[PDB]
Amino acid sequence: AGVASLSAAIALMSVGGVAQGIGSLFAALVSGTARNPSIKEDLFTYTLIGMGFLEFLGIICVLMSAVLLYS
Amino acid sequence: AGVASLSAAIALMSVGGVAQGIGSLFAALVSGTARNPSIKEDLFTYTLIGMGFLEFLGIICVLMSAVLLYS
Amino acid sequence: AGVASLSAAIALMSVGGVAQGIGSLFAALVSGTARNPSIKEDLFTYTLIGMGFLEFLGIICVLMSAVLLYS
Amino acid sequence: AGVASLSAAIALMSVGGVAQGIGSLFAALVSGTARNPSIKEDLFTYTLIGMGFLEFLGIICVLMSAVLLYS
Amino acid sequence: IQHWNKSYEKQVYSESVALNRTFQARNQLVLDRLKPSGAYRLPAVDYKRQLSRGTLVEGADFYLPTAQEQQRLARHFEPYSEQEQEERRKFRFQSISVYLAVALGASFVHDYFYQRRPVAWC
Amino acid sequence: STSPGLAFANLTLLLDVPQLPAIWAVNAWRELNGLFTEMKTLAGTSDLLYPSNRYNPQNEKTNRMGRPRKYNHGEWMFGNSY
Amino acid sequence: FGPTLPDHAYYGEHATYNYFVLFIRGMRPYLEKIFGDCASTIKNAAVAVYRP
Amino acid sequence: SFAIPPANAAALADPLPATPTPPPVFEAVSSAALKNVEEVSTMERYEAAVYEESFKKPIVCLFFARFSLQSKVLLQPFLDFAASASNNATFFLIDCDRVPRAAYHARVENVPSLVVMKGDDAFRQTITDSVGVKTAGDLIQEARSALDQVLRLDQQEGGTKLQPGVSSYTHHIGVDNLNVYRKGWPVA
Amino acid sequence: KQAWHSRMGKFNDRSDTPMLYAYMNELPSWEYYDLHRSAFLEHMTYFLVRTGGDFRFFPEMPPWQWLAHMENLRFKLLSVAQSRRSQLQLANL
Amino acid sequence: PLGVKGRSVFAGMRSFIGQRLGRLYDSFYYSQSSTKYVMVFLFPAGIFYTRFRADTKLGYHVFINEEKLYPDYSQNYFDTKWTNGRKVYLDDETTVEQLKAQIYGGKAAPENVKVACRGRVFEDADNVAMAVRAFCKRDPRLLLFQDNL
Amino acid sequence: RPGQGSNAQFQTSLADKTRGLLGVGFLRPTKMASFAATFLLNFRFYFMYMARTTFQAVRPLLAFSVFGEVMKLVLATMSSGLFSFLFSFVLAFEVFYFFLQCYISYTFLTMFFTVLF
Ligand SMILES: CCCCCCCCCCCCCCCCCC(=O)OC[C@H](COP(=O)([O-])OCC(O)COP(=O)([O-])OC[C@@H](COC(=O)CCCCCCCCCCCCCCCCC)OC(=O)CCCCCCCCCCCCCCCCC)OC(=O)CCCCCCCCCCCCCCCCC
Ligand SMILES: CCCCCCCCCCCCCCCCCC(=O)OC[C@H](COP(=O)([O-])OCC(O)COP(=O)([O-])OC[C@@H](COC(=O)CCCCCCCCCCCCCCCCC)OC(=O)CCCCCCCCCCCCCCCCC)OC(=O)CCCCCCCCCCCCCCCCC
Ligand SMILES: CCCCCCCCCCCCCCCCCC(=O)OC[C@H](COP(=O)([O-])OCC[N+](C)(C)C)OC(=O)CCCCCCCCCCCCCCCCC
Ligand SMILES: CCCCCCCCCCCCCCCCCC(=O)OC[C@H](COP(=O)([O-])OCC[N+](C)(C)C)OC(=O)CCCCCCCCCCCCCCCCC
Ligand SMILES: CCCCCCCCCCCCCCCCCC(=O)OC[C@H](COP(=O)([O-])OCC[N+](C)(C)C)OC(=O)CCCCCCCCCCCCCCCCC
Ligand SMILES: CCCCCCCCCCCCO[C@@H]1O[C@H](CO)[C@@H](O[C@H]2O[C@H](CO)[C@@H](O)[C@H](O)[C@H]2O)[C@H](O)[C@H]1O
Ligand SMILES: CCCCCCCCCCCCO[C@@H]1O[C@H](CO)[C@@H](O[C@H]2O[C@H](CO)[C@@H](O)[C@H](O)[C@H]2O)[C@H](O)[C@H]1O
Ligand SMILES: CCCCCCCCCCCCO[C@@H]1O[C@H](CO)[C@@H](O[C@H]2O[C@H](CO)[C@@H](O)[C@H](O)[C@H]2O)[C@H](O)[C@H]1O
Predict the structure, then answer these.
(1) Is F66 exposed, middle or buried (0-12, 13-18, 19+ CB in 10 A)?
(2) Any chain G CB within 8 A of the CB of I28?
(3) Cα distance from B52 to chain C (closest Cα, Å)?
(4) Is E62 helix (H, G, I), strand (E, B) or coil?
(5) Is F6 in the pocket of ligand 8 (CB under 6 A)?
(6) Which one of A47, D42, H159, H183 is most buried, by most CB atoms within 10 A?
(7) Considering only CA atoms, which of C56, C54, C66, C57 is closest in space to residue C29?
(8) Cβ(B45)–Cβ(C45) under 8 Å?
(9) H helices of E27-118, where?
């Protein structure tokens, strides 16, 4: 029951790979608010959509970690 | 077949590059909507096209992973 | 018999890297469209050519992966 | 037993890296065209030359991978 | 090449002729016999055609069934009859007494008729 | 219309409302089998029939568990051995 | 070979004046009769039990 | 995103203006009220008909338009049919451009069109030639058959068996949303 | 009103984010003529000529008789034009 | 004005059912051939068959002890190979001999083959249902083995 | 007659009308199979949506429960006063973090439970 644990630990890399990308998205939100404060909404919607995508990828990798951890 | 579970983990590590790509894309989208907002209808469309590719690639990276986890 | 499987997993990781590159291209195109809207068609065509080449490389990797799963 | 397969997979990862490199080329293309269309043909020629070199290197890598596969 | 693409178009439209003949036969055999009358047609018209006709109305997610209820805001002098007024005066507040009674009854029934479970005896 | 939060209900409906015809058909088949069993019982049987049981193989030469009856070769003054 | 289908075969009905809402608005009187009769029956039974 | 501009002065103008009339020489060609029908000019009259007269005894409505030659050909035999069978039914003459809401009501898509009506949906039979194969006599024969059928069915079963259908609860609101005003429903 | 129109458009329209446009193999009249402008013209000239009529009475779906006649006339025209091209347009070179 | 004199509520029910059926026919006619036949006949039929079979018949998971006892399925299509754990639906009158023949495709089975459930050998002139009821109640996992001993 | 000229062209073969009866180019069983395949493959979206929904629903529960368990471990282990003084601020941070997660979940849930019609 050691290979399952190692497989899950190896699958956990995409979490760190996704945190990069969430960082860039919210950095872009910040820069857009600094360049055009007249548009706060209509930037946060797109930010939340892309963040939702990356959250889905995080859910995928964590789910598969638990899968390989018990199967 | 624990090596199956290892291969799967490796096959999921690719999400780290996928999400990064998606992040960069949406970051550029937000920057565009903060620079030339009146053409969101263009930018969002192009973004959707890009996602239609990236999504597909990620789905492959899942599918084959599961295949190597079963076969 | 999983030694072939690891090779397939590595190929999948390569595919993810290709996906990241595709996302970068899309991001650049969106930024370009925002800066110069009237020239979209030319930029879009150039992006399409790049996308096709990247897609070809990705398909090549997936194919080799399938081959390595059996042979 | 499948060391050659592992080597082929590693070569594939290198190919993915090459694709990522290409992405920057075509991003610069879609940006320099937005910034000066009148010299776009010249920019396209330079981008094509760079792309050809990158493709050549990738082809060389693939040839090496095939040789490795066949010992 | 010219020869070959021309003959390609030729037997393309040959296949088209065949398709048209079978299309005619299918229609006049099967579909003209199985066609609906029109009595049980769809009792509506698409919103685009209504919009072009100048007929579409968008409003009133709700409705008012009775004319007595429709003309209330236009009467201005008797929005409600006197009988209706005194009947409405009985509902100035909600009935916590009735709430309590109904809730206790429903809880009693739900607990001692519908949610009985076994218990050990020593 | 719909939404991501209604995926549970959408899946459940799509997969279960087509099964309701089959469920009703199963119920009707069960009632008919019960009717036929009760008509047979009214007509008469050598050995009894258990109504709410899956299968009733008992007869003159067969037990209530599908095996041959023991001590059933001869005849008995009190009639059937059961 | 052209359109074989009309537009209403594809397009969604009106959002606010739709088939079901018109139908149930038409059936309102019969349902009122039904449920009022049932409620009155139950109430009369309960009152005949509770008064004595 | 779909839109149509609201209207134009041309569209809202009079659809049926007068045109010049010739002298009595152009009329000389090789091929050379009415006391039995009712020309309808108003959706009020059309509704009165459909909701009272069509419940008393059946109606036959001819929907035409001026541009159509088939309407001109079909007019006279329609008047003869009316003179024949006015005892059993009422007969109406409607122009689609003058009264479009009557055409939307009857669900006419081509002109000319005969429409036999009883109870406003208990019997509605539309007769037309969407293809272009029939003739006026064929249309009138079909109309006579439909009128006979609806009369027989009204006599059938003690006057019943012809009750209104979906219009009992729809009020032709999906067909023409402007009936919400007639029903008095809000539009806010 | 604007919400009504936007909702109906998002639901029914052909878009990059389609709700109802899905599993399309036999199209309805409106979408068919919006995608195939060549056929709208042909189906419309035939209607005005076969029946002297106004565009306002344009049928939702045409008859199969009309469609078959159109295909026969297309045969005639393409035959004549193709044979003319075959003779003269290529002896040029 | 609800109701009319001389007319019955049953007549109105018949009217309504006629209306509904006519409308269904109209909507089925004016529909895509690609989708409607599938969605209206083939998915309902398959779902009906599956649900009826599960809710009515009774099935068993079959296993075999050794690979040498596996059947030959090379010729018959869609199953070239035996796999253990196959769900097998049977009738109440089925016997062990009939089950064995069904497994081995009406062909010559090996010698001294017997069926067991939870370690308990079945006679071949036994009803599978009652034998399972006796030996393995609510655990119908059957095993085929060679009884040489 | 008006349409006799066109209806004279419509005369078919026996094989033509058999082919039409069978509906060769108008049933398209390959199209039916493609539709069935696409329709069954589209069931993945329900799984994706339910996964997202459950994650957004349990996010506050996690922030309240598992980080709570961690804080409880630290409380059980710590004894002195300096560390406790410093840990009070961590607890307050956890309060604010919980409210942040609750706000995020509210946003995503109003997005996922909003219906046009
Ligand atoms: C365990 C539950 C079991 C059931 C499952 C639950 C399903 C229902 C869920 C409802 C949830 C709603 C939330 C609660 C509502 C709160 C507010 C409120 O009710 O306002 C006050 C309101 C008072 O009304 P009012 O506006 O002041 O009107 C007073 C008038 O003056 C009175 O004069 P009148 O002229 O109006 O008439 C007099 C009299 C009688 O009426 C008459 O005029 C005479 C005619 C009466 C004769 C017929 C009687 C009715 C039918 C028979 C009933 C009993 C037995 C049935 C036996 C069957 C046949 C034998 O009126 C009534 O009887 C009122 C009818 C009560 C029905 C409930 C209200 C409708 C709500 C819709 C519920 C949805 C259910 C679906 C329906 C079924 C499918 C279609 O309260 C109520 O009357 C309703 C009682 C609520 C039910 C209790 C359920 C418990 C709620 C739990 C909430 C707490 C949550 C957390 C729990 C943990 C705590 C620690
Ligand atoms: C074996 C092979 C199996 C394969 C199938 C084989 C064929 C078998 C028969 C058909 C089976 C498929 C049925 C599918 C129908 C539903 C969806 C559909 O496909 O419709 C498309 C089809 C076309 O849709 P469309 O072209 O887009 O729109 C045109 C309109 O539908 C045009 O409508 P309209 O403008 O002419 O009229 C408006 C229409 C509206 O129809 C609609 O458009 C929407 C219908 C809503 C459906 C969803 C409602 C679910 C609501 C939940 C229920 C909650 C109840 C709460 C109770 C609490 C009380 C305590 O009004 C209705 O007629 C609907 C009545 C049913 C709704 C009942 C709702 C409760 C109110 C109760 C009223 C009182 C009873 C009736 C009184 C009348 C006098 C007797 O729908 C229709 O043609 C008419 C609606 C269908 C009504 C049901 C017809 C009877 C079905 C019988 C099912 C029995 C199956 C069991 C067989 C036995 C096996 C053992
Ligand atoms: C049993 C549990 C039911 C609980 C859930 C349902 C809600 C409970 C309330 C009762 C439900 C039924 C309400 C019916 C309302 C319709 C009344 C009405 O007038 O409709 C117009 C019909 C048609 O009328 P008509 O068109 O012939 O003549 C009148 C014309 N107008 C309306 C213009 C004046 O009226 C009737 O004739 C009676 C219909 C109601 C009786 C049927 C009940 C339907 C429920 C069963 C469904 C299945 C039908 C097949 C049954 C086969 C039996 C073997
Ligand atoms: C607690 C319970 C709460 C839930 C309520 C439970 C009851 C109500 C649940 C209903 C929800 C699901 C309803 C979905 C219905 C889907 C069925 C459907 O529409 O089919 C797809 C087809 C597909 O049509 P389509 O493909 O052209 O268009 C569909 C939609 N688009 C355009 C987006 C693709 O729909 C139809 O047109 C037919 C539907 C009506 C027919 C219904 C089946 C009965 C047919 C009987 C007549 C057979 C005639 C045979 C004659 C042969 C000769 C020609
Ligand atoms: C579209 C719908 C969107 C839905 C969004 C749903 C997301 C929000 C879900 C969070 C629910 C969490 C609340 C329950 C947890 C607390 C349990 C509890 O009360 O303990 C008993 C508390 C604590 O009592 P105590 O700690 O003093 O002693 C008793 C404690 N027990 C019994 C547990 C041992 O009882 C109280 O006295 C409470 C009084 C103060 C008020 C507390 C409410 C504020 C804290 C929770 C707010 C959460 C909502 C934030 C909304 C933000 C949205 C912008
Ligand atoms: C003051 C009078 C007011 C009127 C109240 C009259 C209400 C009468 C309704 C009774 C209906 C209850 O319905 C019944 O509920 C009980 C639970 O308690 C269920 O009981 C079930 O579970 C319990 C506990 O395991 C067991 O007894 C048994 O397995 C089974 O009977 C029944 O399966 C169900 O049929
Ligand atoms: C056309 C025929 C009739 C159509 C109506 C169909 C509706 C029947 C559904 C009622 C619920 C049935 O649910 C259950 O099934 C059958 C009776 O049917 C009974 O089942 C029990 O008695 C029946 C006798 O008929 C036995 O065959 C069965 O072995 C036993 O388990 C249960 O006591 C009942 O709870
Ligand atoms: C319009 C009316 C429709 C009402 C619905 C009526 C149900 C329609 C389906 C009837 C199908 C009958 O088909 C029959 O079903 C039963 C039960 O599966 C099968 O019978 C099988 O199970 C039963 C119960 O143990 C036993 O007879 C035996 O074990 C076995 O033969 C028959 O092999 C099959 O021929």
Answers:
(1) buried
(2) yes
(3) 11
(4) coil
(5) no
(6) A47
(7) C54
(8) no
(9) 32-34, 47-53, 67-70, 72-75, 82-88, 96-112
Look at the block and give the residue holding tokens 């937005």. Answer: D34
CA distances from J43 to B42, J14, K28 (A): 41, 29, 18
How far apart CA H147 and CA H169 sit, in angstroms, is 26
Name the structure determination technique.
cryo-EM
Q: Which residues are J63's β-sheet partners?
A: J143
**Which residue matches tokens 């099967």?**
E30
- 3 state SS for chain H: CCCCCCCCHHHHCCCCCCCCCCCCCCCCCCCCCCCCCEEECCHHHHHHHHHHHHHHCCEEEEEECCCCHHHHHHHHHHHHHHHHHCCCCEEEEEECCCCHHHHHHHCCCCCCEEEEEECCCCEEEEECCCCCCCCHHHHHHHHHHHHHHHHHHHHCCCCCCCCCCCHHHHCCCCCCCCHHHHHCCCCC
**A27, two tokens:** 């950095």
In the three-class reduction of DSSP (H, G, I as helix; E, B as strand; rest coil), residue D5 is classed as helix
Residue with tokens 């596969």: D69
CA D42 distance to own-chain centroid: 21
Among the listed residues B23, A20, C52, C58, the one whose alpha carbon sits nearest the alpha carbon of residue D16: C58
Instruction: Compute how many other C-beta atoms are within 10 angstroms of the C-beta atom of residue E66.
Output: 8
Residues with CB under 6 A from ligand 5: K 60, 102-103, 105-106, 109-110, 113
Q: What is the residue extent of each domain of chain D? A: 1-71
Query: Which residues are near ligand 3 (CB < 6 Å)?
Result: G 27, 30, 34; H 163-164, 168; J 4, 7, 9, 11-13, 15-16
Q: How far apart are CA B25 and CA D25, in angstroms?
A: 16
Residue E35 tokens read as 């066609």
Six-digit token string for I53: 């009529």
| Inter-chain touch E27–I90, beta carbons under 8 Å | no
Closest-CA distance, I4 to chain E, in angstroms, reads 7
Crossing angle of helices I64-84 and I37-50, rounded to 10° = 110
Using DSSP, state whether J117 is helix, strand or coil. Answer: strand
Name residue, tokens 């099935």. J59
H runs (alpha helix) in I18-93: 29-35, 37-50, 64-84, 90-91
Q: What type of residue is A45? A: T
d(Cα H178, Cα I9) in Å, to the nearest integer? 22
All chains having 3 or more CB pairs closer than 8 angstroms to chain J: E, F, G, H, I, K
Residue type, J66: E
Q: What does R_g of chain D's alpha carbons equal in angstroms?
A: 16
